[PDB]
Write a protein that binds this DNA or RNA. Structure first.
Ligand SMILES: [Mg+2]
Ligand SMILES: [Mg+2]
Ligand SMILES: [Mg+2]
Ligand SMILES: [Mg+2]
Ligand SMILES: [Mg+2]
Ligand SMILES: [Mg+2]
Ligand SMILES: [Mg+2]
Ligand SMILES: [Mg+2]
Ligand SMILES: [Mg+2]
Ligand SMILES: [Mg+2]
Ligand SMILES: [Mg+2]
Ligand SMILES: [Mg+2]
Ligand SMILES: [Mg+2]
Ligand SMILES: [Mg+2]
Ligand SMILES: [Mg+2]
Ligand SMILES: [Mg+2]
Ligand SMILES: [Mg+2]
Ligand SMILES: [Mg+2]
Ligand SMILES: [Mg+2]
Ligand SMILES: [Mg+2]
Ligand SMILES: [Mg+2]
Ligand SMILES: [Mg+2]
Ligand SMILES: [Mg+2]
Ligand SMILES: [Mg+2]
Ligand SMILES: [Mg+2]
Ligand SMILES: [Mg+2]
Ligand SMILES: [Mg+2]
Ligand SMILES: [Mg+2]
Ligand SMILES: [Mg+2]
Ligand SMILES: [Mg+2]
Ligand SMILES: [Mg+2]
Ligand SMILES: [Mg+2]
Ligand SMILES: [Mg+2]
Ligand SMILES: [Mg+2]
Ligand SMILES: [Mg+2]
Ligand SMILES: [Mg+2]
Ligand SMILES: [Mg+2]
Ligand SMILES: [Mg+2]
Ligand SMILES: [Mg+2]
Ligand SMILES: [Mg+2]
Ligand SMILES: [Mg+2]
Ligand SMILES: [Mg+2]
Ligand SMILES: [Mg+2]
Ligand SMILES: [Mg+2]
Ligand SMILES: [Mg+2]
Ligand SMILES: [Mg+2]
Ligand SMILES: [Mg+2]
Ligand SMILES: [Mg+2]
Ligand SMILES: [Mg+2]
Ligand SMILES: [Mg+2]
Ligand SMILES: [Mg+2]
Ligand SMILES: [Mg+2]
Ligand SMILES: [Mg+2]
Ligand SMILES: [Mg+2]
Ligand SMILES: [Mg+2]
Ligand SMILES: [Mg+2]
Ligand SMILES: [Mg+2]
Ligand SMILES: [Mg+2]
Ligand SMILES: [Mg+2]
Ligand SMILES: [Mg+2]
Ligand SMILES: [Mg+2]
Ligand SMILES: [Mg+2]
Ligand SMILES: [Mg+2]
Ligand SMILES: [Mg+2]
Ligand SMILES: [Mg+2]
Ligand SMILES: [Mg+2]
Ligand SMILES: [Mg+2]
Ligand SMILES: [Mg+2]
Ligand SMILES: [Mg+2]
Ligand SMILES: [Mg+2]
Ligand SMILES: [Mg+2]
Ligand SMILES: [Mg+2]
Ligand SMILES: [Mg+2]
Lengths: 134, 257, 158
RNA sequence: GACUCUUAGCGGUGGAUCACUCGGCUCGUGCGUCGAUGAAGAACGCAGCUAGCUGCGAGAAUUAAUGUGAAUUGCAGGUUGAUCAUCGACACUUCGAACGCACUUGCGGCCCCGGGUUCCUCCCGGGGCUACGCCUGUCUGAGCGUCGCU
RNA sequence: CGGGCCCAUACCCGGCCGUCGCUGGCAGUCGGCAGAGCGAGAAAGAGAGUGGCGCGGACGCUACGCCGCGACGAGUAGGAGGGCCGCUGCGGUGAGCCUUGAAGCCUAGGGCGCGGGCCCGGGUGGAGCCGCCGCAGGUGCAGAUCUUGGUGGUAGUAGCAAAUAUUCAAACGAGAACUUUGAAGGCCGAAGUGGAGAAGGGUUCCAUGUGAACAGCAGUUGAACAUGGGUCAGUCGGUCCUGA
RNA sequence: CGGUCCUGACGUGCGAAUCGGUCGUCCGACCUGGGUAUAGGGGCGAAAGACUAAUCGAACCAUCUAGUAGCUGGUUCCCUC
RNA sequence: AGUCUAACACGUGCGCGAGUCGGGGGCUACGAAAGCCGCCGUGGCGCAAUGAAGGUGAAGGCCGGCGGCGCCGCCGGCCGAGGUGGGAUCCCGAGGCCUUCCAGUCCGCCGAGGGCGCACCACCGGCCCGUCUCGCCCGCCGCGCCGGGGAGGUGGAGCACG
RNA sequence: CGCGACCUCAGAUCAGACGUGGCGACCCGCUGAAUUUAAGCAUAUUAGUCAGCGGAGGAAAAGAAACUAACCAGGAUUCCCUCAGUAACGGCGAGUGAACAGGGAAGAGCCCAGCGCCGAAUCCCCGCCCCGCGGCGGGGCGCGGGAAAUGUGGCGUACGGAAGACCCACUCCCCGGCGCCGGGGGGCCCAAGUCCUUCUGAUCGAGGCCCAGCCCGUGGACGGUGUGAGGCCGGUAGCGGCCCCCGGCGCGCCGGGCCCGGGUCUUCCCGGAGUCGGGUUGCUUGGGAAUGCAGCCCAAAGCGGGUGGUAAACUCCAUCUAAGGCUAAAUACCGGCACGAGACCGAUAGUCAACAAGUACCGUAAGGGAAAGUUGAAAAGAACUUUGAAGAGAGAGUUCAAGAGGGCGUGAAACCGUUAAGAGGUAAACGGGUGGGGUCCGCGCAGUCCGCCCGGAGGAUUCAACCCGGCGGCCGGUCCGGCCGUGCCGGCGGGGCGGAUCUCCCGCUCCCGUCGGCGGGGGACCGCCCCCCGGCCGGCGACCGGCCGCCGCCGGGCGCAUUUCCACCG
């Protein structure tokens, strides 16, 4: 149950906020879970998706075990494009099929200084939380 | 509804003649909304019959004596297995219906150990019934933050708090109650009596002092004593088939003519 | 039109009464706000009585109530000068004063003087510079024991 | 056999019903802040492709800074921080209490600069002023108003 | 005047439905620990004491239930009672229903109820819905020259009739009564159907392209639609003056 | 500039006052553009209660206002007494 | 398209009851709910009416004596809060309810006649307040334009075990 | 004549400031109707209300008695309950209508003029120097300039004050800056299944995950994701974490202002005028021989003046001190900036406006003012072939579905086309009764069964009785033991509560360590209740334990087939 008297349970308000969130909030919404091995080796459960990460598709018509590289993150439509998840149009052109990041599992992150800083921050937060809990 | 809703327009009746129905019409204008019909409950737009007002008598008033009467009746009904099972609780494996546990329970702080306590007391089937009863509400209530519904489960009564509410509040269907602040709204949900109750030893001891006995009046109420019985022996069959009564009757006539 | 036996009534609803209808939907909010402000003031004035200054014994005016006592506005100047307290020091040390009150008899005056003497024997005074005590100031033994009391300081019971 | 009526199937016209809801209505809470340092309101302009809506002001779908940290997207285009959010520096067209006089966007006055002159006057451009009432102080005045000296 | 005959929801006999009355009957289902009853003209005991083998017996009674006797049944204005009649939302309850298919809609399908209505079957549809106990209401339409929206007959009908008038050939074009060019016949007739301005309109002006919509037939045409262009002042006027 | 008569045409018209023939006046109390003044119990009127933006024996716009109506119209399911 | 708010009247259901009611205030996600306060019951309504008002404000009798038959007071004591009629129910009981016949014992039932009578109804008395008439007595800090009392009529939205 | 003062009055694009206009939900001051009611209507009512005008704030206004009362008296203002639909007003009709006292929320008081005393002891501005500087302030210096004696500052204000004398007491106040110690706004974060199998176009559906009943839970609110998710994502809980900026409560420091009191006695001082009050007129009020306000005329006093709800004279009391000023809180809020929620409406509803809505459009103008939501999960929005000038078709393809084809969810009625069936000179249509034909249903087409007995064929762990063990139901006329009472009686018992039942000490005040008074604490008694002990009554059918007895059931033996039971046949 929610006890904070300054956040809503209003369905309409939550939908409006989600569909009108600015880009830097779209980034936070567009988060995907790391694989089992990455999760074990980083102590971090999820990471906002980036443009050049290897991922897998877990649900839908394109689910499988193949490793695909993200092509572009289309924040306006809340979908991401992978390098070989695509269908065939009528004329013969191949266009990409959008997939929600919540149905995708990250396989190998694109590391830079800021990404590493995010990972270490999340790891430290989970460590302090576990110390408090136990 | 809004007090000025349906009255924004300036509109007057066209009068008799011109083969229209004497209802007010919107004034002039080169638009569809022109001479169309403005005021009156039967027109599209315009006010309704008796616009609702905020000063309707929303709240009600009940005497303290009969509020306490109802609380006493609900507590009395909550100690009968027939009434509790009729209300629908799965109390078949419960050892004794006025379920009292020691005061160490009041010091729990983990939902896990609260769940273990419920499992050992064999009240877990009621929470499983609540899990089964979780479904989606019917009608236009979904669009108004009343999307999900579920069944009410057993109620926990504590004398004083040491983490009991923290431990139990996550489990569905559980209602934590202070012994000194019992309300009929949560003791007898839906207007029906016989909710399954789990008590603690200290609260159970204090309840007697709270509501008084037949001889001893309530000490935590300024002036209160338990309500009396209009008839004591409610065993009607036992009364009827007793020697003193059965002596003074005429012979039955059961010959159909 | 009256019909049969009834009681003919005079409803005062011939003005524009629906324009002025003061509802009470914010009553619980007002009660919460009042209680919160009460707690804020009580915690702000740290050791002082939460119900403000002491007030004297007062007879109700009219014949209908003249057998009952209650709490008045403040102590009278005759009562102060008989008790020995100064007009401008009484308010500082927490005694309600009004220069309007007369004293038509000795019994009320003496009762209020005795009440002032009891209160003066009862209060505890702090050094406004803690590192330096003074003459009429109390000692650390009671400075440690000082605490607020709820309700009126010296309740007026008949 | 034509035409007419009823019924059913199918197909039309039409948008009823049902289910949805980034909208309202009501209640409650906290705060409770405009303007001559130019407000509210109006007009006109600004995007590579842009009409309306939105944002903005000749620095014109924004600059600077802080935070976040890899995008925007309908089509093109070319990590020492793209985009968003915040917003404390800068900037802010013409009207409008609207302020040089009028309200055509017409006609001026004073001062100082750069073209002209080589200040000798014109003429061109730019910048700073040029409203009403009123308070304090300053300067210049007035009166067969009350006096004083000569 | 006589026999016979015909029939109303009236009268008689019978069945069923409901209402009213008897403020009628039933706790007695008292069973091997047992002994079957209270209906029959005429008050009140299946009264108690003291002396002279085989293990058996239907249904019933949601008492707000069930059962039995009689009588009765018109109805506007109006009153009252009962609705397991119907609609929307809330509190409880149904270990309720639901993508192996909810709501809604159609149905020469099968039924139930006096009725309000309801339940199944078939099809369509694609995401939610309902039963019982209580609570609440913006809660049930055939009418109001009712409001809004849509559709008919009239009806392929009335009409496309004020100001004299058209014709031949060719070109483009998928397509010509209407476009264009040439020829002929006509009209306005210099107070014009001519050439130019003021107020007013505001891009209608010019070229190309199109022929969805509009130009009450048609259009290869347009004041339509889409792309692009076009208004040059010391000496035309405003600007200045004053008039009411 | 005006509008007699045909009481003609039309009268869901070309037109919410138009058309035709016939008519009155045509150097004046003449016709007319622009500017300007008079505003609603007010203006203006060679005077018809005429005109004052298709509205005039008291314009138009918003509000008081959901004005009052002893008067017309309507008033939504079933059965039972 | 008979709604909501307020008032009133009666009828029904509930809690308490000569009392009842916290509605205003205060103390302690659902919860703006709930619980609690009694020296927070101030207050409202009810428990007393009547008069314009000053005001007044809801049973008596008997026994025995003294004084001014009877009446009044000092007294002491006792009875003590109506009556008539009709009244659902309850109480008593002349006798009787059989299995052969007699007597008597316990329980139960019926019943001539006779009673204590609920609520309510009618009638007759009584008491309180206003008013009228007739009358004589009583009290004293102030002896008075003082205070109190009786008998009989009549006016009241009164009393007569809430 | 000239010059110099002061007084009144001018001009400045003089130096430095200030006002204007907007919004207006709440507030303050004026102005002020008529619909309506009275069953007509004129006073009255509507109503000091709408319209109109002016002025602000975060609140405004009011506010510390020229008060209420008549008591054993209370004591600024504002708000709530009650007073009370009352006193009173009213063609005494319709109608209207307060306040005092009481209980509460809040609670805070003060300052001038005047009379006096202090060498104007007072204030503003320009210049330099030092510091501070986004609220223009502090300090030093000017034979610097003004304001002010037609009155500035200090003391001082009705509660009395001042001065002097006599006693007692005191060195704890405030600010300009500096340095130190621990709520608000913002940012980034912190649990657990995408486990196995199986449905589907797609899973968030269904089953399972043991003896740890998968894992987390201080987190099972919500939203998104291809239906329906506590564990996929954001979030949610937590006195959880980290990182930025701001304020207050405190700390010491430097400097600055100020050297500050009380009690008694004596001597002095002491107040607001065209105002009060009176007459008249008009409005207003519940205010009635005039409640408040305003105009005109008259027009004061100082043991005075106002008030004491009926006009007036006389006479006593009571109570305030008008004609000058400031002041927080409790209180109001349909505008504005953010929020949170709902037994509310669900696109003819809800705001006029769910959408390029005060928009399109209309009117010269003031103003008037709409209609309009939904493909799909994802455009995968139909390549390509072909007839036609083309709209538009026939094929092919996407999709789970085109039976979703760009006003495309579902797709009703009116109305229309076509197919099939039937019928057709008294318009059609309708009620009752049949007949005929259709489309469908019964998945009808050899007809019901259920128990007992006789007979015929068969097969069993197989019946009764008996033994062991377990459980259960009814009992012991009067078995032993317990518990309970809307039960009682005992008590040389131990207590909590209450009493409008009585009576040792302490505090207060009244007296020359004392007689006697008041409040409080201590004890006695009474009543209730809880507990320890004892004794009877009843119950255990809202509330039992062991033993014994009977009966019943179940499991296992032993029983072995004229018993019992299974399935068929007549
Ligand atoms: Mg939180
Ligand atoms: Mg509406
Ligand atoms: Mg529904
Ligand atoms: Mg009537
Ligand atoms: Mg049909
Ligand atoms: Mg539509
Ligand atoms: Mg549609
Ligand atoms: Mg543009
Ligand atoms: Mg930038
Ligand atoms: Mg940056
Ligand atoms: Mg001009
Ligand atoms: Mg019959
Ligand atoms: Mg009949
Ligand atoms: Mg009938
Ligand atoms: Mg869907
Ligand atoms: Mg509703
Ligand atoms: Mg209809
Ligand atoms: Mg024709
Ligand atoms: Mg024509
Ligand atoms: Mg001609
Ligand atoms: Mg021309
Ligand atoms: Mg021309
Ligand atoms: Mg052209
Ligand atoms: Mg055409
Ligand atoms: Mg030239
Ligand atoms: Mg000019
Ligand atoms: Mg004429
Ligand atoms: Mg004619
Ligand atoms: Mg005709
Ligand atoms: Mg005039
Ligand atoms: Mg004329
Ligand atoms: Mg005339
Ligand atoms: Mg007029
Ligand atoms: Mg009307
Ligand atoms: Mg009439
Ligand atoms: Mg009644
Ligand atoms: Mg200047
Ligand atoms: Mg202003
Ligand atoms: Mg009238
Ligand atoms: Mg009338
Ligand atoms: Mg009239
Ligand atoms: Mg009047
Ligand atoms: Mg009035
Ligand atoms: Mg107004
Ligand atoms: Mg402001
Ligand atoms: Mg103020
Ligand atoms: Mg004063
Ligand atoms: Mg009353
Ligand atoms: Mg009034
Ligand atoms: Mg008061
Ligand atoms: Mg208080
Ligand atoms: Mg002075
Ligand atoms: Mg979901
Ligand atoms: Mg699962
Ligand atoms: Mg899940
Ligand atoms: Mg979820
Ligand atoms: Mg997570
Ligand atoms: Mg998380
Ligand atoms: Mg008046
Ligand atoms: Mg004054
Ligand atoms: Mg004053
Ligand atoms: Mg809430
Ligand atoms: Mg619509
Ligand atoms: Mg709408
Ligand atoms: Mg719809
Ligand atoms: Mg609808
Ligand atoms: Mg639609
Ligand atoms: Mg949808
Ligand atoms: Mg489909
Ligand atoms: Mg579809
Ligand atoms: Mg459709
Ligand atoms: Mg058809
Ligand atoms: Mg046919």
């Amino acid at each position: 149950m929610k006890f904070n008297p300054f956040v809503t349970s209003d369905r309409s308000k939550n939908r409006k906020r989600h569909f009108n969130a600015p880009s830097h909030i779209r980034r936070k919404i567009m988060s995907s879970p790391l694989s089992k091995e990455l999760r074990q080796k980083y102590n971090v459960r999820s990471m906002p998706i980036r443009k050049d990460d290897e991922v897998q598709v877990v649900r839908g018509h394109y689910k499988g075990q193949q490793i695909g590289k993200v092509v572009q993150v289309y924040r306006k439509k809340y979908v991401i494009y992978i390098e070989r998840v695509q269908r065939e149009k009528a004329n013969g052109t191949t266009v990409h099929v959008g997939i929600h990041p919540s149905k995708v599992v990250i396989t190998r992150l694109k590391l830079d200084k800021d990404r590493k800083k995010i990972l270490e921050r999340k790891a430290k937060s989970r460590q302090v939380g576990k110390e408090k809990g136990k | 509804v809004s007090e000025l809703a349906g009255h924004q327009t300036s509109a007057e009746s066209w009068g008799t003649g011109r083969a229209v129905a004497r209802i007010p019409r919107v004034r002039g204008g080169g638009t569809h909304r022109s001479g169309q019909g403005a005021f009156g409950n039967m027109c599209r737009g315009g006010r309704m019959f008796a616009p609702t007002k905020t000063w309707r008598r929303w709240h009600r008033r009940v005497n303290t004596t009969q509020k306490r009467y109802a609380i006493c009746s609900a507590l009395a009904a909550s100690a009968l297995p027939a009434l509790v099972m009729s209300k629908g609780h799965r109390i078949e494996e419960v050892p004794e219906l006025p379920l009292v546990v020691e005061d160490k329970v009041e010091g729990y702080k983990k939902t896990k150990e609260a769940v273990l306590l419920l499992k050992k007391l064999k009240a877990w089937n009621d929470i499983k019934k609540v899990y089964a009863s979780q479904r989606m509400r019917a009608g236009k209530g979904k669009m108004r933050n009343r999307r999900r519904i579920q069944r009410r489960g057993p109620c926990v009564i504590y004398n004083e708090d040491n983490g009991i509410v923290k431990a139990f509040r996550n489990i569905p269907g559980i209602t934590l109650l202070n012994v000194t602040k019992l309300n009929i709204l949560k003791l007898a949900p839906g207007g029906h009596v016989g909710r399954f109750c789990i008590w603690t030893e200290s609260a159970f001891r204090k309840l007697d002092d709270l509501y008084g006995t037949w001889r001893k009046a309530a000490s935590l109420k300024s002036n209160y004593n338990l309500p009396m019985h209009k008839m004591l022996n409610t065993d009607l069959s036992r009364i009827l088939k007793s020697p003193e009564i059965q002596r003074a009757l005429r012979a039955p006539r059961k010959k159909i003519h | 039109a009256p019909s049969r036996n009834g009681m003919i009534l005079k409803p005062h609803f011939h003005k524009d009464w629906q324009r002025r209808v003061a509802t009470w939907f914010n009553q619980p909010a007002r009660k919460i706000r009042r209680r919160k402000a009460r707690q804020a003031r009580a915690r702000r004035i740290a050791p002082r009585p939460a119900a403000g200054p002491i007030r004297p014994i007062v007879r109700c005016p009219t014949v209908r109530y003249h057998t009952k006592v209650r709490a008045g506005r403040g102590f009278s100047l005759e009562e102060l000068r008989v008790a020995g307290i100064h007009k401008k020091v009484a308010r500082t040390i927490g005694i309600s004063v009004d220069p309007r009150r007369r004293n038509k008899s000795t019994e009320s005056l003496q009762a209020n003087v005795q009440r002032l003497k009891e209160y003066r024997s009862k209060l505890v005074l702090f050094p406004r510079k803690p590192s330096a005590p003074k003459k009429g100031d109390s000692s650390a033994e009671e400075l440690k024991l000082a605490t607020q009391l709820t309700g009126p300081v010296m309740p007026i019971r008949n």
